[PDB]
Design goal:
heterodimer; A: 195 residues; mainly beta; 4-stranded antiparallel sheet; two-stranded antiparallel sheet; 2 helices; 4% helix; 19% strand; globular; B: 592 residues; mainly alpha; 22 helices; Spike protein S1 (chain A); transmembrane (chain B); EC 3.4.17.- (chain B)
Chain lengths: 195, 592
């Protein structure tokens, strides 16, 4: 069964880092060749899996995520690495298995007038657990005695804008990133490799 | 609920919005600089007003936070940059009046109109006409009359504006415990940071005075040689034992000497090393002219300009398709944007300014790691110094014939290159007593030993005792001279120029001690030395984060200013200049 990675990678709207699109794969035998066939990629370095053994082992479940980050922090999405986007928005497992893909999205995911669409969160209470997703008005009430909840002085909003212009340089232009996590629970058969 | 961490969070909140609004302001400024249309003027004014308003808002937010005993020694310096509320600390009526005064200052400098009584309606203005008349004509009386009349008609309206400028800025500096505006300008050099690397105001002015004291004899002998050549040209009115007027000094103000090169050149049988004849053959274009500069910066080890910036940058004047400004600028817009803007010719003056601007861009690459609020040089004068180091390397014949550009047969000899060093000595050496003289004037007027009414006698006394220039007509307070400079109306300090000179000579000495190409300083190169590139880039990446004393320790090992590189650089000249300069009078007489 061919499952459409054509919707996984090529699309119109990718969400920001604070809400990654979690898509489950349990009813297909995916054609793992787009990594050579789609486009030349900024990041093929990945802690989990090798290109030789992606099809060798019979992998039963796949998760897929898509968002966009800065070109400077493409390597920041990795186990162990710390920073305001890794351990506060999307933290990877310490021994995560899977290979991640990143492509420059400056061709169409960037407006010359400006794109005040994506956001990123700067401060949770501490470093978030890996694979923990939150979408809420988490007003980090920095009160010497607390901001009473809404719409006042000293009340710092959590999410900071992610303004986008194609006139930027390499390392600050938009770079979209998709990650593929591979899981085998104590599980029945759902997905196996092609023959 | 921690307070220092709250301040750090405020720093993050400031810097993110500050950078993404500063890009919006600077792109609109670039759009104004590209095509002159009123849509761009309105956009630039709106963006600048937005940027200033938000900057004032986080300035108030920073002023409300406590500052006592809060140290990461990096966040503290960011807050020291952000604590300053500006000129709105006093009643805002006087601040708005001061900004209106500065607008009037700029407009009346831009419209310093003077015309002859023979043709009052048909005349010329300051910038395009008087400069080329000075650089071409050699008349004593006409240049004297134009100089005197211009200075009188300027000073008559520039005297009271500065006179009530200084009194307001005294109390403006008295806000937040500074003593004078000169002390505030010296506080740009302040390091109240990690102990053992301290820097304050009193030893700053002491260092400037001492370094000029060891500068002084070389300028004195160059001045004597210049006056000897002028007496070989024009000996009639001026006595050969005294000073000379400023209007034969190559500029109306006297802040340059390069226009005296044609009159004062020795060894005239060899004109200067000129290859302008040969781009009839090689046909070099400005884009590939930039390309040898990029190859030069890759050669020393520094990273190269990214390929997209080639179509970001403007590499040629538009021409007749529209009008634009012709000024070599290195625009760092922000968010990693780096553009070069100039009306590009083919001559080596344009090549040299291209090297200087590329040095500016490369330094802008280097300090890109630090946050937005710390994105300037370690002092006010490293931008104009880093490009000035690269200006020296491309001048030597060794660089031209190492890349094969020069005809191979020329090389260098005993008979030449004095004609190359004296050109730099007119460019570099004579500036230093002038900047020291007038900036010491301004700082010591701020110190107050000069009465505010009597600004002419200590002016002319210090000019005779430092730069050795005599006024031929006495001046009262209406004939106000010192306000007529380009930067006095704009209120800019000149310590960046003296400091950049001393700094880039120290840098030349340092980087010629890590390249193995040993000899006198002028004929040594920076090209292709990985250890030298490592030392330079170790300096370059610092930004404003660590203090400038440690930045200068990163290259030379000396905290303070040392003029010994300058003396060693110009001493191949000095073995010969004083020897030919002997049997003449030495020094300046105050009577003449």
């Amino acid at each position: 069964n061919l499952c459409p990675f054509h919707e996984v990678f090529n699309a119109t709207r990718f969400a920001s880092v604070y809400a990654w699109n979690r898509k489950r794969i349990s009813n297909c035998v995916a054609d793992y060749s787009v990594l050579y066939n789609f486009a030349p990629f900024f990041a093929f370095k990945c802690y989990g899996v090798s290109p030789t053994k992606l099809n060798d082992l019979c992998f039963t479940n796949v998760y897929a995520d898509s968002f966009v980050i800065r070109g400077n922090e493409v390597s920041q999405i990795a186990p162990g690495q710390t920073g305001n986007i890794a351990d506060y928005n999307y933290k990877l497992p310490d021994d995560f298995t899977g290979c991640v893909i990143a492509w420059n999205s400056n061709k169409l995911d960037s407006k010359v007038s400006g794109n005040y669409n994506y956001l990123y969160r700067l401060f949770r209470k501490s470093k978030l657990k890996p694979f923990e997703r939150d979408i809420s008005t988490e007003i980090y009430q920095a009160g010497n005695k607390p901001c009473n909840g809404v719409a006042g002085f000293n009340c710092y909003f959590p999410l900071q804008s992610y303004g986008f212009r194609p006139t930027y340089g390499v390392g600050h232009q938009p770079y979209r990133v998709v990650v593929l996590s591979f899981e085998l629970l104590h599980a029945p058969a759902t997905v196996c490799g092609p023959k | 609920s921690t307070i220092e961490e709250q301040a750090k969070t405020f720093l993050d909140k400031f810097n993110h919005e500050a950078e993404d609004l500063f890009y919006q302001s600077s792109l609109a400024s670039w759009n104004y600089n590209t095509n002159i249309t009123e849509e761009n003027v309105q956009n630039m004014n709106n963006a600048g007003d937005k940027w200033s308003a938000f900057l004032k808002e986080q300035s108030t937010l920073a002023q409300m936070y406590p500052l006592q005993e809060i140290q990461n020694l990096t966040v503290k310096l960011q807050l020291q940059a952000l604590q300053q509320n500006g000129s709105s600390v006093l009643s805002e009526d006087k601040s708005k009046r001061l900004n209106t005064i500065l607008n009037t200052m700029s407009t009346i400098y831009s419209t310093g109109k003077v015309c002859n009584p023979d043709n009052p309606q048909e005349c010329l203005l300051l910038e395009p006409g008087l400069n080329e008349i000075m650089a071409n004509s050699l008349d004593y009386n006409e240049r004297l009359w134009a100089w005197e009349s211009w200075r009188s008609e300027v000073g008559k309206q520039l005297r009271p504006l500065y006179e009530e400028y200084v009194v307001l800025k005294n109390e403006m500096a008295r806000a937040n415990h500074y003593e004078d505006y000169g002390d505030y300008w010296r506080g740009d050099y302040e390091v109240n940071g990690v102990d053992g690397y301290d820097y304050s105001r009193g030893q700053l002015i002491e260092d400037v005075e001492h370094t000029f004291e060891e500068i002084k004899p070389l300028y004195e002998h160059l001045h004597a040689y210049v006056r000897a050549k002028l007496m070989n040209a024009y000996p009639s009115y001026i006595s050969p034992i005294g000073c000379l007027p400023a209007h034969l000094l190559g500029d109306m103000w006297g802040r340059f000497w390069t226009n005296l090169y044609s009159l004062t050149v020795p060894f005239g049988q060899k004109p200067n090393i000129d290859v302008t004849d040969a781009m009839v053959d090689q046909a070099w274009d400005a884009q590939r002219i930039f390309k040898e500069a990029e190859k030069f910066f890759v050669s020393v080890g520094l990273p190269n300009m990214t390929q997209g910036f080639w179509e970001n940058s403007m590499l040629t004047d538009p021409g007749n398709v529209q009008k634009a400004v012709c000024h070599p600028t290195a625009w760092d817009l922000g968010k990693g944007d780096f553009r070069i803007l100039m009306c590009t010719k083919v001559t080596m003056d344009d090549f040299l300014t291209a090297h200087h601007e590329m040095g500016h861009i490369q330094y802008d690459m280097a300090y890109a790691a630090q946050p937005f609020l710390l994105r300037n040089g370690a002092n006010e004068g490293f931008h104009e110094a880093v490009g000035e180091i690269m200006s020296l390397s491309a001048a030597t014949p060794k660089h031209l014939k190492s890349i094969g550009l020069l005809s191979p047969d020329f090389q260098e000899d005993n008979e030449t290159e004095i004609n190359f060093l004296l050109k730099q000595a007119l460019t570099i050496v004579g500036t230093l007593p002038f900047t020291y003289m007038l900036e010491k004037w301004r700082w010591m007027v701020f110190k107050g030993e000069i009465p505010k009414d009597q600004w002419m006698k200590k002016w002319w006394e210090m000019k005779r005792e430092i730069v050795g220039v005599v006024e031929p007509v006495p001046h009262d307070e209406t004939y106000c001279d010192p306000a007529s400079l380009f930067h006095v109306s704009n209120d800019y300090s000149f310590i960046r120029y003296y400091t950049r000179t001393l700094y880039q000579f120290q840098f030349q000495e340092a980087l010629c001690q890590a390249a193995k190409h040993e000899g006198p300083l002028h004929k040594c190169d920076i090209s292709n030395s990985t250890e030298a590139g490592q030392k330079l880039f170790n300096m370059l990446r610092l930004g404003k984060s660590e203090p400038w004393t440690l930045a200068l320790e990163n290259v030379v090992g000396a905290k303070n200013m040392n003029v010994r590189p300058l003396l060693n650089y110009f001493e191949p000249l000095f073995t010969w200049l004083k020897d030919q300069n002997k049997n003449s009078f030495v020094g300046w007489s105050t009577d003449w």
